[PDB]
């Protein structure tokens, strides 16, 4: 092309849209807008930060301990917890890398080879984990107890992980289903499309008004397993390069096999025979698989990044400045 | 115009048939290890018959790690075979598991020989009977390739690697000069550092130290995992603190969860501790590794960008020569 592509993080962009306490010039989030946060761009209300103090940053997260430490742990506590931004970047990496483990930066902190670390580990994990004093907070308590005793075991840190990973997705389907225990097809559309912000649309929705009939609707189970597929969208895009390659079309039984190649699971064909419906782009049989892969990582990225090259312009603003200011003294010295 | 891979079958492929170019299994070989041919290796013209009897060093060779260098030049091996073989070396962890699945149409573990060349051209993105295809499918493509045996081909192919460049380099014998395992270190490194580095291996290193092929091999091993070793890297790098010969050994244990000898570790802190503190350059270490990992035969990122600006440059200095003609 013309240029080299830059991706410009927002990660601190979202954090700042949806934090809603400030103490001492810096600012945190409550387990309920870091939810919010990872599942969508914008705030509802946006309601003035409340500025706290230390006495009442410290009773934020006091009268917890009754949030149930499996996948409702976020849900649970509601606002009474506090999230740093590190602490933030961390779980926003968690989510977007859902098959990294970490385990070389985990041992790198584990000086004394226990397979455990020590909460004064806590903040370079996040650092590594995350690039591309200090007040008490929710993951602090948990991981390392209340006044910094106990140490974050791997296995519980794989555990946090993956109840991390179930919970949003737990979360966005209630979202999108409107508490009401399914989810309309228009909604799973919704929602799959929610970061796909390029003007296309007309056709997805279309699509979906004609092609898939008022009434149907998938499942907690089915959702969680195509956000599974969506986290193996490398291994389908293996697949879908093995047909581009052979100049061949992919058909519906096509894309069923590539999707239980890609994930290893076998996908209901109510699921998969909408999802076929919405990305076929024209009135024929075939899969308009490109844009459904850009979706797809739409969809992973969470409107995290964006994409851009605005590197020449820079380039030709140094050039223009240096060869004026050049010439302001080559010639003021000539004739 | 042509690509780094296309260039180097170029330059190492001795035989030619029907207008195609072929290489032998050593050809191969010393395709991944060098960049130049030393002879210029004699272009053989080749007839329906004679490939015949080229394929007919498959009766004789063993099937693990002494493959390729059994056959010698016995065998023949096309560019889409060798850019397949390239992509096993180069990229030694994926497994490739999820091509081979979509050609496995069948549900058993196997593929026939129609989807072998199907294999090669996913693998590699970004009828004449071949050596491969005889060990695979058959003379006459009579069966087929299970997934475990082609796992345990690509793993035999990475050790015969390593074997034979630990023979050229130690010259025949079981050790290698720390020296000439210097030469192997730097091999695909241009002229940047150069002389500090030599520098070093000349005055840092007492005369007649050397490794042994295990030694060797665990480098290697640690080569493969440059990106857990650059994770290490870059909690010192955040850390603002040196790398010292400690924290070394613990970051290579740590990224191959193997215990490589002192006297490897030590030799290599020595020659990447390029400003003479107790402290590595391990930057520039980690682009050599690299550089090794990739063998000359791919460009990469950082290379891409940098070769684009020199374009940009070029094309800059075109315009400005040409908008001053427009005035005079």
């Not at 455990?116 to 996040?126: A, D, P, S």
């Not at 699509?207 to 969680?224: A, M, P, Y």
């Not at 400045?321 to 302001?328: A, C, L, Q, T, Y």
């Amino acid at each position: 092309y013309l240029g080299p592509i830059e991706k410009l993080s927002l990660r601190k962009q979202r954090f700042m849209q949806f934090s809603s306490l400030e103490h001492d010039g810096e600012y945190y989030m409550t387990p309920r807008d870091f939810l919010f946060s990872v599942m969508f761009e914008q705030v509802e209300r946006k309601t003035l930060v409340k500025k706290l103090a230390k006495k009442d940053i410290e009773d934020v997260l006091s009268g917890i301990q009754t949030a149930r430490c499996g996948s409702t742990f976020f849900r649970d506590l509601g606002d009474k917890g506090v999230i740093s931004y590190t602490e933030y970047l961390f779980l926003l990496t968690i989510l977007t890398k859902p098959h990294s483990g970490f385990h070389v930066a985990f041992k790198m902190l584990d000086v004394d080879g226990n397979e455990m670390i020590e909460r004064k580990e806590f903040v370079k994990l996040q650092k590594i984990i995350s690039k591309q004093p200090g007040v008490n907070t929710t993951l602090q308590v948990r991981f390392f107890g209340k006044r910094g005793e106990k140490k974050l075991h791997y296995k519980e840190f794989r555990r946090f992980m993956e109840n991390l990973q179930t919970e949003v997705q737990e979360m966005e389907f209630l979202q999108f289903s409107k508490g009401l225990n399914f989810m309309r097809k228009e909604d799973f559309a919704e929602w799959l499309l929610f970061f796909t912000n390029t003007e296309n649309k007309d056709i997805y929705w279309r699509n979906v008004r004609e092609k898939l009939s008022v009434g149907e609707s998938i499942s907690l189970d089915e959702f969680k397993s195509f956000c599974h597929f969506t986290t193996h969208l490398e291994d389908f895009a293996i697949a879908m390069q093995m047909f581009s390659l052979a100049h061949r079309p992919v058909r519906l039984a096509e894309f069923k096999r590539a999707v239980k190649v890609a994930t290893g699971q076998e996908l209901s064909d109510n699921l998969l025979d909408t999802v076929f419906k919405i990305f076929d782009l024209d009135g024929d049989e075939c899969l308009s698989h490109g844009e459904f892969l850009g979706v797809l990582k739409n969809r992973m990225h969470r409107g995290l990044w964006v994409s851009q090259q605005q590197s020449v312009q820079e380039y030709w603003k140094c050039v223009k400045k240096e060869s004026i200011k050049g010439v302001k003294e080559a010639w003021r010295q000539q004739a």
